[PDB]
């Protein structure tokens, strides 16, 4: 299912041309799951991300 | 017994409250020069949520206004600033009427006479300028005034023979004979520069403080170092008190009000309960103001505001 999220701390900006920010992502269900994700676009700390598959992992492309 | 308490702050400035002047003829208007180029007429409602409101800002200066003074009546003012000018004001409609040019450095302080006709001023030009009430200077001083700046100039409001006195940054309190422009007394006693001079209302005891932090006061009739008042950091300002017979001295972050003949520090005057922004410096206390009744004490601070002090007789 779809899962709504939050941003704890932005880690670093990865990608082929530096287009992807890599971000440490908390959930909004009071969950202690601090997943790391690949977000494309401008991000600061304290965003509200919206994922479709909430079990994916951060790689470096 | 007699303590000093807070009732409120007069928050109307944007720069440092450089010097405060109060008048005994009006118990409602306070005049506080500032470092945001404006002098603000205050109005004292003395209620619970505003001890003072601003009434008429006086804007003529293109730099930091240093020293303001009110006349013997509550309708004329006088001020100077760091652009070498002096602006004679008008309290009724809130404008200027006369403008005193002739200085070549920053006008540091300006004193007002009791007869309201002798205007004196000290600048960074190592010179003292004596004026009319109109604008033509009468005599400019190069009688070896100081080797460096002239930080504060003050008249002597005595019923006796008057005198004019002016400290400086060369550790010296030089005494001058008015209308004859000659030295009277030197006082080689200070380590480091000076910041202010105040004169007691009788006209006998002058005080003078500076970088040494110690209010070394002198006598105007014979020249004795009477009392070595002690302080912590720099003395930004000094002022006397006619009724309670004290000496208001300025610490950096606090105020030291002193019994004079007893030499007891009676109160400490400060307000710091914060801790996350106390890693830096606490704000200095730049000026001091004593009103007519002496129940109120006004201080000029570095958080752009003026704090009131009440003498609770206990």
């Amino acid at each position: 299912p779809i899962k709504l999220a939050r941003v704890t701390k932005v880690l670093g900006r990865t990608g082929s041309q530096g287009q992807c920010t890599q971000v440490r992502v908390e959930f909004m269900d009071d969950t202690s799951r601090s997943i790391i994700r690949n977000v494309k676009g401008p991000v600061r700390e304290g965003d509200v991300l919206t994922l479709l598959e909430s079990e994916r992992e951060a790689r470096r492309l | 017994t007699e303590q000093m308490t807070l009732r409120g702050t007069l928050k109307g400035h944007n720069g440092w409250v450089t010097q405060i002047a109060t008048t005994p003829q009006f118990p409602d208007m306070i005049l506080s020069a500032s470092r945001d180029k404006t002098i603000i007429m205050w109005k004292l409602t003395r209620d619970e949520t505003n001890y003072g409101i601003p009434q008429r800002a006086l804007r003529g200066h293109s730099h930091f206004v240093s020293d303001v003074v009110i006349s013997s009546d509550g309708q004329f003012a006088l001020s100077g600033s760091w652009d070498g000018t002096l602006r004679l004001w008008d309290l009724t409609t809130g404008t200027t009427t006369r403008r005193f040019v002739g200085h070549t450095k920053d006008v540091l302080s300006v004193a007002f006479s009791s007869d309201n006709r002798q205007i004196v001023s000290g600048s960074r030009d190592k010179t003292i300028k004596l004026w009319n009430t109109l604008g033509v200077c009468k005599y400019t001083v190069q009688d070896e005034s100081h080797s460096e700046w002239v930080s504060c100039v003050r008249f002597s409001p005595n019923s006796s023979n008057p005198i004019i006195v002016s400290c400086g940054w060369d550790k010296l309190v030089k005494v001058w004979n008015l209308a004859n422009c000659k030295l009277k007394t030197n006082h080689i006693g200070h380590t480091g520069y000076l910041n202010t001079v105040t004169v007691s209302p009788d006209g006998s005891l002058c005080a003078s403080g500076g970088k040494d932090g110690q209010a070394m006061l002198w006598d105007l009739n014979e020249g004795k170092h009477l009392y070595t008042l002690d302080g912590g950091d720099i003395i930004n300002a000094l002022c006397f008190s006619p009724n309670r017979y004290w000496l208001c001295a300025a610490t950096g972050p606090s105020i030291k009000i002193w019994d004079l003949e007893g030499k007891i520090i009676v109160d400490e005057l400060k307000q710091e309960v914060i801790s996350t922004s106390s890693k830096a410096e606490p704000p200095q206390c730049t000026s001091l103001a004593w009103s007519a009744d002496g129940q109120t004490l006004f201080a000029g601070y570095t958080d752009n505001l003026v704090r009131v002090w009440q003498v609770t007789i206990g």
Partner: protein, 189 residues
């Protein structure tokens, strides 16, 4: 107190998504009388989040080369669209704008990695500010592309897609691009 074009108020506008709440403007103090403000929103990063999104839609309306400076042209296009929207729906015409910006932006893009001619992409997330940036782009180019050689004016062609994006229809150009931008995104995943 503050009505857009003096007629449309903002108190009953309700943003649905929590993902776009801090980024999509006016509900409270970004209420302006007109979309023209002439303010320095591009002076820093993230500063254009604090600009009224009516001015965002106005600014992206003038994209093509023959209209590139014309702001007084596009503000009356938006003003005339906010009549046709209200006629064809019957409600406040700002709730449909945030319903269109919520619905139109994708939530999973693909980032391009390969060699000269070789394409092997990979699916990533979408920041909600890029969702707001790409919502208004798809809306405005749908209004632009379907009014070109057509008797329909730009005010009708903007309004008839600004409601069709709120209803989530697949006749609107905006939702037709979002579902394909996620369809080719899921195809790698």
């Amino acid at each position: 107190d503050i009505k857009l074009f003096g007629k449309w108020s903002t108190d009953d506008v309700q943003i649905n998504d929590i993902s776009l709440q801090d980024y999509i403007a006016v509900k409270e103090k970004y209420a302006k009388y007109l979309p023209h403000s002439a303010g320095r929103y591009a002076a820093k990063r993230f500063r254009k989040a604090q600009c009224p999104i009516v001015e965002r839609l106005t600014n992206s309306m003038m994209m093509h080369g023959r209209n590139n400076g014309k702001k007084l042209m596009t503000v009356r296009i938006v003003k005339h669209a906010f009549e046709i929207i209200h006629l064809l729906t019957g409600e406040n015409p700002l709730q449909v704008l945030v319903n269109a910006i919520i619905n139109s932006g994708p939530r999973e893009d693909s980032t391009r990695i390969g060699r000269a001619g070789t394409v092997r992409r990979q699916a990533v997330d979408v920041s909600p500010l890029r969702r707001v940036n790409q919502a208004i782009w798809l809306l405005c180019t749908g209004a632009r592309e379907a009014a070109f050689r057509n008797i329909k004016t730009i005010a009708e062609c903007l309004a008839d897609e600004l409601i069709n994006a709120a209803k989530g229809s697949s006749n609107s150009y905006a939702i037709k691009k979002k579902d394909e931008l996620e369809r080719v995104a899921k195809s790698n995943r």
